């Protein structure tokens, strides 16, 4: 029960609570209530990233 997301673009975390990823990376969504952001999971963190950087490939 894993949702797969691309990651489309470098991001680099402005807060805590967000992460720091690389184009490519893999991620498992968490949460798409929020247009803007997304909660995340990708090895054992959880956390924020914008939506604009991910792409659903489920």
Same mark, same amino acid.
């Given at each position: 029960?894993?949702?797969l997301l691309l990651v489309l673009?470098?991001?680099? $975390?402005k807060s805590? =609570?967000?992460l720091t990823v690389k184009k490519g990376d893999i991620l498992t *969504?968490?949460?798409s209530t929020?247009?803007?952001w997304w909660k995340v $999971?990708?090895?054992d =963190?959880?956390?924020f990233l914008?939506?604009?950087?991910?792409?659903? *490939?489920?």
């Open positions: 029960g894993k949702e673009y470098d991001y680099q $975390e805590p =609570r967000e *969504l968490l949460n929020n247009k803007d $999971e990708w090895n =963190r959880q956390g914008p939506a604009a950087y991910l792409k659903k *490939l489920d």
